[PDB]
């Protein structure tokens, strides 16, 4: 499968999440995604085919994971934006007030701005600290997906949002949205991963 930020994958033939970013660890291919999407060694499938397994994760506390892929997967420096793509250029962290977009299999590609950093989300499982908040909307299924600036700087992976009964927070004004992501930089240094860029 071609590994592109934002596309759907399933975990153990049950949950769905979205790919965050193509990365390598030495000769190993992988992608980063959210920790709550799977436990270590859970099987990841894209389009019905097994592409790899969860190698490590931390959830709750943090929310991060990376999936190690078989050699047959093609890693690409890109994030899906409809039928088009945003090229991943690096991972300079943007500041509050910066515009940012996110990509995932439920709501597609949505943009907004970063509104706050170091937010704690209190999920049923326990708190996850250190999250950045944006007001781009998102929905159930978008977890793990890419948050990236238009300029191609990878910001992090989707963690959670104040979804309403329709499964997303796209039907309430941007002012009332809290869409949270896990910063990419600590995931990259914690697992010794290098981002695929183009």
């Amino acid at each position: 499968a071609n590994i592109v930020g934002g596309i759907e994958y399933s975990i153990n033939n049950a949950s769905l999440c979205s790919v965050g970013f193509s990365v390598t660890r030495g000769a190993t291919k992988g992608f980063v995604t959210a920790g709550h999407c799977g436990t270590v060694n859970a099987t990841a499938r894209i389009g019905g085919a097994v592409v790899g397994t969860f190698a490590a994760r931390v959830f709750p506390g943090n929310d991060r994971a990376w999936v190690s892929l078989t050699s047959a997967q093609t890693l690409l420096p890109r994030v899906a934006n409809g039928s088009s793509f945003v090229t991943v250029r690096g991972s300079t962290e943007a500041a509050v007030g910066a515009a940012v977009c996110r990509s995932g299999r439920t709501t597609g590609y949505q943009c907004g701005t970063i509104t706050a950093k170091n937010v704690t989300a209190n999920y049923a499982e326990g708190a996850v600290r250190g999250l950045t908040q944006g007001n781009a909307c998102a929905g159930r299924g978008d977890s793990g997906g890419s948050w990236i600036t238009s300029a191609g700087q990878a910001q992090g992976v989707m963690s959670g949002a104040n979804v309403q009964s329709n499964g997303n927070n796209c039907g309430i004004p941007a002012s009332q949205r809290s869409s949270l992501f896990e910063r990419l930089q600590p995931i990259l240094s914690q697992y010794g991963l290098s981002l695929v860029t183009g």
């Binding site: 959210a34 709550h36 929310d63 209190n122 999920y123 998102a138 929905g139 809290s178």
Partner: peptide, 4 residues
Amino acid sequence: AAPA
């Protein structure tokens, strides 16, 4: 907010 809830996970996703």
